[PDB]
Design an enzyme around this catalytic site. Structure first.
Site, PDB file in Angstrom:
ATOM      1  N   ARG A   1       0.091   4.155   0.122  1.00 40.71           N
ATOM      2  CA  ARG A   1      -0.771   5.227   0.590  1.00 40.71           C
ATOM      3  C   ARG A   1      -0.377   5.644   2.009  1.00 40.71           C
ATOM      4  NH1 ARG A   1      -6.393   1.994   1.978  1.00 40.71           N
ATOM      5  NH2 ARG A   1      -6.578   2.145  -0.327  1.00 40.71           N
TER       6      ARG A   1
ATOM      7  N   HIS B   1      -0.581  -0.863  -5.548  1.00 36.78           N
ATOM      8  CA  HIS B   1      -1.748  -0.007  -5.682  1.00 36.78           C
ATOM      9  C   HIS B   1      -2.424   0.158  -4.319  1.00 36.78           C
ATOM     10  CE1 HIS B   1      -4.171   2.072  -8.803  1.00 36.78           C
ATOM     11  NE2 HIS B   1      -5.184   1.885  -7.910  1.00 36.78           N
ATOM     12  N   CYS B   2      -3.371   1.084  -4.272  1.00 38.70           N
ATOM     13  CA  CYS B   2      -4.097   1.350  -3.042  1.00 38.70           C
ATOM     14  C   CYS B   2      -4.722   2.743  -3.145  1.00 38.70           C
ATOM     15  CB  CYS B   2      -3.194   1.219  -1.814  1.00 38.70           C
ATOM     16  SG  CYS B   2      -3.519  -0.369  -0.965  1.00 38.70           S
ATOM     17  N   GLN B   3      -5.519   2.922  -4.189  1.00 36.37           N
ATOM     18  CA  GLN B   3      -6.181   4.196  -4.414  1.00 36.37           C
ATOM     19  C   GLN B   3      -7.437   3.997  -5.265  1.00 36.37           C
ATOM     20  OE1 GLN B   3      -6.822   6.760  -3.115  1.00 36.37           O
ATOM     21  NE2 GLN B   3      -5.412   8.429  -3.653  1.00 36.37           N
TER      22      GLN B   3
ATOM     23  N   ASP C   1       0.841  -1.185   0.000  1.00 33.69           N
ATOM     24  CA  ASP C   1       0.000   0.000   0.000  1.00 33.69           C
ATOM     25  C   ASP C   1       0.885   1.248   0.000  1.00 33.69           C
ATOM     26  OD1 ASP C   1       0.417  -1.632   2.391  1.00 33.69           O
ATOM     27  OD2 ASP C   1      -0.587  -0.053   3.608  1.00 33.69           O
TER      28      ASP C   1
END
EC number: 2.8.1.1
Length: 108
Positions: A24, A62-64, A22
């Site tokens: 993020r 990814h992480c959005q 992640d």
């Protein structure tokens, strides 16, 4: 290897033994946490580098909900190398694609 997948099958790889990095926030999102994930922001992906501690065969990145990953999704794939890096189709859904809530501060 700038590649991606669909928010349905990607849940098979992770459930198969794929680490979900992640990229993020942490505390800002401490509220919720995917059913796995793996803290590894550019900061760590840079200062630390490839998610060795979380490296196997195929790692995701990814992480959005659609922002701007492709921006630096290349050098990034080379940052988590040597390894098979992938992106998550613009849509944090995936795990939520099946109406599944993430790990919150209060599960039970």
């Amino acid at each position: 290897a700038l590649t991606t997948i669909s928010p349905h099958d990607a849940q098979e790889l992770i459930a198969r033994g794929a680490k979900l990095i992640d990229i993020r926030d942490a505390d800002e999102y401490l509220r919720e946490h995917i059913p796995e994930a793996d803290l590894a922001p550019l900061s760590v992906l840079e200062q630390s580098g490839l998610p060795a501690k979380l490296r196997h065969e195929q790692i995701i990145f990814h992480c959005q909900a659609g922002k701007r990953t492709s921006n630096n999704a290349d050098k990034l794939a080379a940052i988590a190398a040597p390894a098979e890096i992938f992106l998550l189709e613009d849509g944090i859904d995936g795990w939520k694609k099946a109406g599944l809530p993430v790990a919150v501060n209060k599960s039970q």
